[PDB]
Structure formats: C-alpha cells, structure tokens
Design a binder for this molecule. Structure first.
Ligand SMILES: c1ccc2cnccc2c1
Lengths: 16, 337
C-alpha cells in the first residue's frame, strides 16, 4: 500500500 | 450545547458584519520588500513590511490568468471570506489590494511550513498526532459550516504548522458561502468527494469526506485513493471500496468508513447530529475539544526555524518578476476586490 503510493509518483505537492 | 450555540451565534454575527461591508485597498505593493517565493494563477511570496518590519505571506494572482481560468468569483470569494473570518486555526489576512495587473492578499507569515512537508519527511503521524491535527480541522469546519461556508480544498499542502505546532488553514480559493448546494468542479484529485466527480449538486458533506481522506493520509502516510493518473483515482473514489493498513486502530477504521461514505446522505458530519457524530466518536474519546481550541494541548512537534523571517521550511522556486503593466487590466471584473 505505502510502497504502491510511492510507486504512483504522486508523492509531491498536489495541484488543484 | 448552549456554550457552543452562543459561541457560534456570536461568531456568525461578527462574520456577517465584516461580510456585508468588506475591507478594500488596505495597503499597496511598495509598502513591502520582497524576500523569497514560498510557493506557486499565481504564487505566494514572503515579504517584509518596510515600516513595521513584520513578515507576511503575499498571495499574488494575475488578473488576466484568473479570468482565463474562470476563477473570478473564486478569487472574490477568497478575499471576502479571509477578511471576515476569525478563528484560531485560520490564517489571518492583514491587507489586500490590487494594481493594474494583479490581486494581492497579504497574510501573516507562518514559518513552520506545510503539514505536507512534515508528513512526507516523517512518513506517517501516529494516531495521537493525527488526532491532534484532525481535532483542529473538525473545530474549524464546525466554525466555517456554521457560517454557511464550505472549504473544498482540505489537504496537507494547505495546512501550515505555526510556531506552537498548531494548524493554520490557508488558501480559501475554493471556499464559498453556500446555504444549499453548489456545482463547481474544483478541488484536488485525491481529495475529491464522489459527488463532485459525478457532477452532482453538492454541499458541505464534501468537507467531511475530505477530512476522511486527510486523517487516512496523516495516519497511513498515503491517501486512501491514489493511482498514476487522476482518471484512475476518480474510479477508485467512486467505487465505494477502501482498504486500511493493519496498523490502524479499529476505532480509526470505523471513523474513516463513516467519513469516506460514498453516499453523502450517510456520511458522518452530514447526519441529523451533524459534527457531533464526529466529535463523539470513540476515536476522539481522549480529545479535549476546549483545550485544543484554547491551544493548551502540547503539540506533536514544534517546527524548527530561526525566526519570523526564516524560509527554511519552504522549498525553492524560480524567482520571477512581479510584473505590473502600465495599463489597467480587467478593471471591471475585479471592481469589487
Ligand atoms: C502559502 C505558503 C506559505 C505561507 C506561509 N504563511 C502563510 C501563508 C502561506 C501560504
């Protein structure tokens, strides 16, 4: 789960 | 009940007074020295008031880009709300003004950085620490919703950590006064409620959904719905399926199932008992709501910074001019700013 989150790439600041 | 009722009634009285007669044009750009870009329709710059020496975060919005991105009403919303609210966990707007090119909102500078950076640095917060932050958002939403305000952009990026380790919510760009439903597609993909994705008329239940996402992300280190691309995220959000890491307490999972209810008519915060279904949940049993409001609770951490002008907890951005045209732009559209 947490590793899959890291794998998504979307760990940086998220724009609207 | 009466303690809270009378608090909220007075809070609404004071909000409505400022709301009816907004303040306007209360500084100008050359009252400030530019220090550093803190974040990037516009950007936020650390500035220093030349007479008082106080530091502020100045949000700068390009009028022409606001028009093109269909954000006129949203920017007017943001400024009118910021100048009218008053609550311990809301960033304080000190000045606002406009010039030929830009709109300016000048807020107290919170040097501790965004919760987002701290959360990514530590990985995940313990449940007590998540609960400390969550409790502030619950009280803040109780306040905002009682004013008929919806927030619509909860996420760790918008939660600044102040000198005492408490939250200040910033960015009211999507906040709006709503007594019924509203229809605009706005927010951040991971935090969008199903009914927003599905283009329905929606209401303040979307803020309680987002709290569910926030608490999950704080306690897990990752949000409940993620994917490579937003379109894949949206399918997960509307699916009605969420899985919890095994380290979550049973109480946390139960609260989150009720906040992350895809059916807005069954979602905690939107039932007959409103916010009290959340405040009375077992996960908040140890929470002293008044002590939180009074900021009498020891925080999980005090951010490290050297002084009120320290930018260490913010990242580095390309430093661009504040261009101001010799000709007024979009004067009619922003007459009321
Ligand atoms: C964005 C980024 C940093 C900030 C710091 N203090 C207040 C408001 C802010 C908005």
């Amino acid at each position: 789960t947490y590793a899959d989150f890291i794998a998504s790439g979307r760990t940086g600041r998220r724009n609207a | 009940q009466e303690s809270v009722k009378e608090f909220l009634a007075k809070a609404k009285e004071e909000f409505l007074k400022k709301w009816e007669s907004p303040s306007q044009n209360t500084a100008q750009l050359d009252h400030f020295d530019r220090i550093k870009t803190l974040g990037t329709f516009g950007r936020v710059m650390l500035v220093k008031h030349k007479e008082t020496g106080n530091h502020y975060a100045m949000k700068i919005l390009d009028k022409q880009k606001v028009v093109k991105l269909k954000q006129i009403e949203h920017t007017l919303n943001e400024k009118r709300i910021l100048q009218a609210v008053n609550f311990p966990f809301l960033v304080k707007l000190e000045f606002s003004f406009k010039d030929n090119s830009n709109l300016y909102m000048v807020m107290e500078y919170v040097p501790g950085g965004e919760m987002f950076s701290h959360l990514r640095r530590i990985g995940r917060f313990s449940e007590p620490h998540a609960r400390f932050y969550a409790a502030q958002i619950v009280l803040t939403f109780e306040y905002l919703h009682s004013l008929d305000l919806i927030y619509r952009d909860l996420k760790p990026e918008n939660l600044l950590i102040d000198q005492q380790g408490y939250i200040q919510v910033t960015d009211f760009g999507f906040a709006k006064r709503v007594k019924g439903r509203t229809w605009t597609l706005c927010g951040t993909p991971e935090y969008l409620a199903p009914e927003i994705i599905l283009s329905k008329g929606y209401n303040k239940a979307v803020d309680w959904w987002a709290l569910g996402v926030l608490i999950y992300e704080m306690a897990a280190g990752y949000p409940p719905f993620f994917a490579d691309q937003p379109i894949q995220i949206y399918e997960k959000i509307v699916s009605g399926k969420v899985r919890f890491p095994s380290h979550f307490s049973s109480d946390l999972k139960d609260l989150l199932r009720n906040l992350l209810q895809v059916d807005l008519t069954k979602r905690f915060g939107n039932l007959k008992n409103g916010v009290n279904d959340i405040k009375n949940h077992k996960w908040f049993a140890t929470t002293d709501w008044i002590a939180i409001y009074q900021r009498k609770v020891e925080a999980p951490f005090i951010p490290k910074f050297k002084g009120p002008g320290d930018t260490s907890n913010f990242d580095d951005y390309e430093e661009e001019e504040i261009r101001v045209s010799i000709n007024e732009k979009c004067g009619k559209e922003f007459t009321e700013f």
